[PDB]
Design a protein around this ligand. Structure first.
Ligand SMILES: COc1cc2c(NCCCCCN3CCCC3)nc(N3CCCC3)nc2cc1OCCN
Ligand SMILES: COc1cc2c(NCCCCCN3CCCC3)nc(N3CCCC3)nc2cc1OCCN
Lengths: 143, 143
């Protein structure tokens, strides 16, 4: 079934998110610094690539954090605000972690795009392939 | 009356917003560039100082604009998201205008703070004095 197939797919995404292994990609190093992410395998159009992983927060805590980060003007803008059902959240990925989602550069004609993925009530912001991706390509996102 | 007095005050703010004269302040120029704003008169605690004026938009248009601005990495982050009643807006002050609200620097211990001011249904983000302000002080905001 076509419904049946989509149900399988949602389950496989849920396991990938949960476990957060982030396989099939690697850090692009320039001068000892991570500055992008490269695909190390193929992705088909519509495949899960990676979560934009940070801390999920509602607007109140968002404004508190925003005020803190305003005290350091070196800080990148890693706060992604969005709407889910009747509720308004923000994924805050400001802190430096080993997670790769937050290191993927933006491009107008990228190969990854954003999607909201629900796991029993909690929204997760994930990047899926917007086209077939070749092993060795830089991963590049748009909205 | 104390209620009566507060009602007067809301009316005076409404006229100031509407007209947008932005008096009692001036641009701080360094090397021909506006880099802050100075008070040219006194403000009492709780007085209206200035609106953070840009374009008011709901989340949908916000994400569209955000995607555009990602194409120029020189762009400042001027998008202020917030919650009003059951609705979620953003004031976008990214475009360079002659408006002074967007030129006021941030400080942890500033002299201006944010407030939402409603005028028959539309929320406006305004800066009011968080303490008595002396003529000649730099205006500095926190949240
Ligand atoms: C500051 O550096 C980044 C910020 C990011 C971000 N920041 C939050 C979004 C705000 C964009 C900043 N604009 C500039 C002006 C208006 C706000 N959102 C995202 N994603 C969103 C979901 C998919 C990936 N990815 C980001 C990757 C970033 O760096 C990658 C390595 N150069
Ligand atoms: C990029 O420069 C500015 C951004 C502003 C902003 N940007 C929107 C808020 C986002 C702050 C950026 N952070 C950094 C990391 C997470 C997001 N909001 C405000 N106000 C909000 C209401 C009262 C004044 N005022 C701003 C003044 C700014 O420059 C002043 C001259 N240096």
């Amino acid at each position: 079934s076509k419904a049946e197939l989509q149900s399988e797919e949602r389950k496989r995404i849920d396991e990938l998110i949960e476990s957060g292994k982030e396989e099939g990609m690697k850090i692009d190093l320039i001068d000892g610094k991570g500055r992008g992410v490269i695909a190390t395998k193929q992705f088909s159009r519509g495949d899960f690539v990676v979560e934009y992983h940070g801390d999920l927060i509602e607007i109140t805590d968002a404004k508190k954090r925003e005020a803190l980060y305003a005290q350091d003007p070196s800080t990148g803008c890693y706060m992604y605000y969005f709407q889910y059902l009747s509720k308004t959240y923000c994924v805050d990925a400001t802190r430096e972690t080993n997670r790769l989602g937050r290191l993927i550069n933006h491009s107008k004609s990228g190969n990854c795009q954003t999607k909201l993925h629900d796991i029993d009530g909690v929204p997760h912001l994930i990047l899926i392939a917007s086209r077939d991706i070749a092993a060795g390509e830089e991963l590049l996102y748009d909205y």
